[PDB]
């Protein structure tokens, strides 16, 4: 519309703004003052129609976002780069007989040692710039400015948790879709059939069986067997919310919950699995709209002409931009009746959060300091534990 209001014309006069004094190397020095009227507009009180509108409160809403897999996180010393692991293969006890060659007492019997070698993690970073002169214009107390400087920092702590939780639930779906053997994969037909298969596959763990681990794709576990058991204190179902609302809605969940394990807290579920994307073709960055889209989510370091390798992850919705279409797929389970029952010790996850406040660079030209947050996180998944995937594929 259009407004011929005496106060709205004063409001919309942008040549008087504070931004004019900070986007020009020479600017206005002394203030004459302004006539402020609250008549026949908003901000109008019944008494004293000539005062400036005043703030009752300003409220920093700071939500503590949590990583649900944080109790799995071991902490290492960030030294070397290859973590390896190994088991001892089964040798079943044999009957003894007193009528043998009796120089087989001299014979040897070594253990057999299935292993697997893991690479490194990656170091991740994020920064935030806080200045000292222009952000003071909009808090009216020192306490609100310090709460702002602290809320920015705790948001930078919280989105690390969001990143790591979304990253690990992308790992556990990428694993089961692509890398997992089709011996651990059971196939369902309908939702009640899948519920009965999930509830019999929980009970297919806690059993001394060499059938449910992928020790055959360890380095030395191709011949022989390796028997794994799993308690119920370390079994986790990873599924969707539309299917957790059906698994918990059965009488078997009630008899698990009564006098026993908390079955609500062993079923880790999400809305539908995957907001994380993968790169399949090594592309480059060509357009400024994609650069600004990456700047919106805090990715400051990437510029035009940067190449993205095959297998890089993004952790937000990227596939709508012109040069990402086709080059980028999604870690999303096919035929969303989906449940992946694992032992929680299979997630080999360790970090290094020792010294993640690197000391600030001041930049006293603009008086805008910068704090960086560096952390090393190693995400892997071990083959020596019971895993079952129940899909319709």
């Amino acid at each position: 519309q259009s407004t011929k209001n005496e106060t709205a014309l004063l409001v919309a006069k942008s040549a008087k703004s504070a931004l004019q004094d900070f986007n020009h190397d020479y600017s206005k020095s002394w203030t004459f003052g302004d006539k402020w009227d609250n008549s026949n507009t908003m901000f109008e009180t019944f008494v004293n129609k000539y005062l400036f509108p005043k703030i009752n409160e300003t409220l920093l809403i700071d939500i503590a976002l949590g990583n649900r897999f944080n109790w799995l996180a071991k902490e290492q010393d960030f030294i070397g780069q290859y973590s390896e692991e190994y088991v001892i293969m089964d040798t079943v006890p044999i009957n003894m007989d007193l009528s043998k060659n009796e120089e087989l007492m001299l014979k040897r019997n070594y253990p057999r040692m299935a292993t697997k070698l893991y690479g490194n993690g990656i170091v991740k970073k994020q920064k935030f710039t806080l200045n000292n002169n222009d952000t003071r214009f909009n808090f009216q107390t020192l306490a609100d400015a310090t709460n702002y400087a602290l809320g920015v920092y705790k948001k930078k702590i919280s989105d690390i948790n969001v990143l790591e939780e979304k990253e690990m639930r992308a790992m556990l779906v990428d694993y089961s879709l692509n890398q997992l053997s089709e011996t651990n994969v059971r196939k369902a037909t309908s939702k009640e059939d899948l519920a009965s298969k999930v509830f019999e596959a929980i009970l297919n763990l806690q059993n001394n069986s060499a059938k449910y681990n992928e020790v055959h794709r360890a380095s030395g576990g191709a011949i022989g067997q390796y028997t794994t058991v799993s308690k119920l204190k370390d079994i986790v179902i990873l599924t969707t919310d539309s299917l957790k609302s059906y698994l918990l809605d059965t009488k078997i969940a009630n008899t698990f919950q009564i006098a026993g394990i908390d079955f609500t807290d062993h079923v880790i579920s999400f809305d539908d699995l995957g907001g994380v994307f993968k790169v399949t073709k090594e592309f480059k960055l060509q357009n400024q709209d994609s650069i600004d889209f990456l700047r919106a989510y805090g990715d400051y370091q990437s510029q035009l002409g940067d190449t993205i390798p095959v297998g890089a992850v993004f952790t937000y919705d990227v596939s709508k931009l012109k040069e990402f279409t086709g080059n980028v797929e999604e870690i999303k389970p096919k035929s969303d009746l989906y449940a992946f029952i694992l032992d929680i010790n299979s997630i080999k996850y360790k970090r290094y959060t020792k010294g993640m406040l690197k000391p600030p660079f001041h930049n006293p030209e603009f008086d805008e300091v910068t704090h960086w947050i560096h952390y090393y996180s190693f995400k892997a998944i071990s083959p020596f534990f019971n895993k079952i995937l129940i899909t319709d594929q």
Binding site: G66, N70, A73, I157, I160, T353, K354, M356
Partner: peptide
């Protein structure tokens, strides 16, 4: 093992690793 002047400026203390104080929020 050999120290000489081992605890020198910021990097010689940065490998003698520093201040596990802030960890991530859940546990």
């Amino acid at each position: 093992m050999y120290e000489g002047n081992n605890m020198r400026s910021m990097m010689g203390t940065s490998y003698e690793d520093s201040r596990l104080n802030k960890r991530t929020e859940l546990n």
